[model samples]
Target: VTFAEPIEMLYACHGKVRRFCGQVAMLSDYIAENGCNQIVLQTIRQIAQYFNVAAPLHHEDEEENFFPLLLQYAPQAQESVDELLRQHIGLHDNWAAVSAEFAKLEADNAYVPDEEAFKRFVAGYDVHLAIEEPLFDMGNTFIPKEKLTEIGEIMAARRRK
Candidate 1:
């Protein structure tokens, strides 16, 4: 289910992003009916952890490592690459509210998180994915194989840190 190739790894991360976002979308109803019991607490907890931990690493891998290499390999992609960078900022902004909600919900069994903000935050990522899918296709075309392996190793190492 995993690929060592950097571009594929990026694609895989995108899939995980969508998967969690989908889970979060469902939580609106799930929590409304069930309330934030252990099930919902642990569920949001896992999702929050991914956003807090793995999600940031993935963004850094793109912004700090992958994006520069993509521009170097394919300068014509500047417009699209810059758009993705800007989108990442918006996603983080959306995340702040939602993750804080999750943090509070995790601690307070009676506290109800806002479904509206959660849905908006998930939608932002959905848009980000639409924009990035094409850009990753560009990556497959321009980013050299060896440099990809370099990026791949860098991504894994940062996860270790």
Candidate 2:
């Protein structure tokens, strides 16, 4: 399998995704340990900004090249790819909803997120990470080295921006 030149751009995107995950994990842990105060609201805004930059590029990379390329090789995996795509959309929606809610909370000093909300956000995000990271593992088994390099360079260029 080959990833093609455009997919190479996803390397930087993937790194950002990873960093975003780690940062969110820290935020979740911090909030869980201490409490969801103004600091957590601020963290949510920062995360939302990162998601704004990262999500569209990630979606485009998958829709434009990665998934299609995967389909070419693993035609039988259509169901799995479709399910993955759905999860991607759902994850974005979940993040957007949480971010929007947090933004309002940040604006209002009186607002505070419930423990359930925080826990759900953390778990939901971890599930997304589970999906994103394994793509590398799956790709390594199928995608050719040249394609990976090409995709990596493309993504790397985006990182510089």
Candidate 3:
């Protein structure tokens, strides 16, 4: 569904974020159970690819459009926005670390991949989604349609990317 209404869009984005997070959770569990098997390694590759796309979308939307618009409307939320940015960086770091480990595992087939590391990365991803969800609400409640349209254009443009 298109998030034409600001609130509707937030809800739409939240739904997408939640679903994506659930996928990561399932991947973590699969890795934990299956170990460093081919299936598990392939799953990690799939998750990394998905996050590579997702993280950039988040970066562009939040950093380039959404947060800046929100700041204009709700200057008081600067602290919250800053914290969310930090969380985004943390999530990216987690993604990078796990992805690197997965790559090494794929290359050498030597190191027994750590399930906990995958879970840790997934947990960080989930936390980042949690932080972002509330910010969506804050934006929907305060930000106007024109501004949201501006943001939506940027968000929707990611589909093309």
lDDT of 1 by residue, 95-140 (tens): 8989888877867767878888899998999888888888788888
User: lDDT tens string, model 2, 1-161?
Assistant: 12344443455565666666666656545765776676776667777887777677677667666777666655665776777778777767767666765666677745554544444555775676566556645665677767656555555455457
The TM-score of candidate 2 is 0.67
The stretch of ten residues in a row with the least summed lDDT in candidate 1 is 1-10
| Model 1 TM-score on a 0 to 1 scale | 0.92
- Rank all candidate structures by their lDDT, best first, as comma-separated numbers: 1, 3, 2
lDDT of 1 at 72: 93
Clashes of 1: 0
Ranking by TM-score: 1, 3, 2
**1-161 per-residue lDDT for model 3 (tens digits):** 56455446556655655565566556545655665678766666666776787656656667777888988888888988899888777877877777777787788755656656667776876777677768777887789878887767667767686
- TM-score between candidate 3 and the true structure: 0.77
- Global lDDT of each candidate: 0.85, 0.63, 0.70
lDDT of 1 at 73: 81
Residue-level lDDT for 153 in candidate 1: 80
Two-way TM-score contest, 1 vs 2, winner: 1
